[PDB]
């Protein structure tokens, strides 16, 4: 088992904390959803290769530009998150998060992840966003942003139902293993 490091970046509303919690427990908490995530080392076997994947969150560091880059040294794969129920989180990807990650993590693969895909067809979400002349992020809008920022790939998931969660972390492991 080789050791690899994963860091998740994105706006506070992007759902990065919940994503790391659901993956680490293989369960969406039934009694209490934690506010914070410390770290975790997940045992993952992808395409016959065993890896120890250390997981880190950047939640709480968004307003502190000198503390935040301390999470980046020796990162092997970046998950760059936005929420499908929030087109504003997607807008902050190309000129805020992308230039930062490329500067502190040169040549590290970036996977753009659309979180909360369960809210794309949620009526409350659609009614709320319509009040600000908006709609849930469309899959092609996600793919186009991923293409534009030079992401390794584009994926979607729902921490709530677990759909797509295993796939994102197995692909992140494969990306971390590449030359």
């Amino acid at each position: 088992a080789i050791r690899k490091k994963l860091v998740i970046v994105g706006d506070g509303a992007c759902g990065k904390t919940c994503l790391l919690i659901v993956f680490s427990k293989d369960q969406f908490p039934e009694v209490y959803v934690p506010t914070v995530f410390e770290n975790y080392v997940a045992d993952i076997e992808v395409d016959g290769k065993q890896v120890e994947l250390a997981l880190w969150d950047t939640a709480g560091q968004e307003d502190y530009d000198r503390l935040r880059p301390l999470s980046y040294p020796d990162t092997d794969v970046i998950l760059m998150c936005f929420s499908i129920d929030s087109p504003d989180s997607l807008e902050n990807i190309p000129e805020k998060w992308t230039p930062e990650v490329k500067h502190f993590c040169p040549n590290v693969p970036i996977i753009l992840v659309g979180n909360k895909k369960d809210l794309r067809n949620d009526e409350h979400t659609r009614r709320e966003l319509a009040k600000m002349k908006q709609e849930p992020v469309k899959p092609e809008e996600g793919r186009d942003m991923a293409n534009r920022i030079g992401a390794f790939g584009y994926m979607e998931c729902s921490a709530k139902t677990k759909d797509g969660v295993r796939e994102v972390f197995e692909m992140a492991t494969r990306a971390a293993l590449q030359a």
């Binding site: 908490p29 009694v31 209490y32 934690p34 506010t35 914070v36 410390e38 770290n39 975790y40 080392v41 250390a54 880190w56 939640a59 709480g60 560091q61 307003d63 502190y64 530009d65 000198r66 503390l67 301390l70 999470s71 040294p73 020796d74």
Partner: protein
């Protein structure tokens, strides 16, 4: 951590830690507030434990087993005793507030109604000055500590054997040297998230809503000051590189 505290904080939440017959006696809003306060104390107990792995397992193990050059152990673990003093004192106050609240005849049933004042005290006056001074120093030495570790693990045989030996047990899986340093750096930015969610469920007593509002503002002032006082130290960087920053 000591067995008494680990057992008291073994459940995933306050609602699972207390007796089901005690839980039934409270309203939903109180259970939500108590679950978040329990998370703050449980993560503080884990943070102090991370600092004890750094001081007792790593630092002291290197001094008592290895022949490192003078100033190497300090470079690997900057401010670890000061950090341990700050957080063990804070943890003691949090655990004493829980202990005082216990029902007679119980070692698990309690409700903490007055957390705000404890947080204002921790994040103001001399203790806030010492937290600001210690984290500004630690976080500015973060990159240098990681680089020094990588060099020693790659070139020193006895150091590599020591690391592999003490990090082999499963309970140290998330707590290698570099992982401990990042766990400590990230601790301070977890406080506003926890305090804001405790505040969201503390409107029932106006004095408590006000105290937590004051505490959240103090924590944010501390973080802004620490963030502004950071400049990464680099071994071998010349004065010209520094004054041309």
């Amino acid at each position: 951590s000591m067995e008494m505290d680990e057992k008291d904080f073994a459940a995933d939440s306050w609602s699972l830690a207390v007796d089901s017959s005690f839980l039934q006696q409270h309203k939903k809003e109180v259970m939500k507030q108590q679950d978040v306060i329990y998370e703050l104390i449980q993560t503080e107990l884990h943070h102090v434990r991370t600092l004890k792995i750094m001081t007792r397992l790593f630092r002291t193990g290197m001094l008592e087993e290895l022949h490192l050059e003078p100033g190497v152990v300090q470079g690997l673990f900057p401010c670890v005793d000061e950090l341990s003093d700050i957080h063990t004192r804070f943890l003691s106050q949090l655990l004493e507030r829980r202990r005082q609240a216990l029902c007679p005849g119980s070692t698990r049933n309690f409700v903490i109604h007055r957390l705000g004042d404890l947080l204002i005290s921790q994040f103001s006056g001399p203790s806030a000055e010492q937290m600001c001074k210690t984290y500004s120093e630690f976080c500015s030495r973060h990159s240098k500590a990681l680089k020094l570790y990588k060099e020693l693990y790659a070139r020193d045989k006895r150091f590599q054997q020591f690391i592999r030996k003490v990090t082999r047990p499963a309970v140290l899986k998330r707590h290698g040297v570099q992982e401990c340093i990042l766990l400590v750096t990230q601790r301070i930015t977890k406080y506003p998230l926890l305090i804001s969610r405790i505040l969201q469920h503390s409107h029932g007593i106006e004095e408590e809503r006000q105290d937590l509002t004051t505490a959240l503002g103090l924590v944010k002032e501390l973080l802004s000051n620490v963030d502004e006082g950071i400049y990464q130290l680099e071994k071998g960087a010349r004065l010209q590189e520094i004054y041309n920053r």
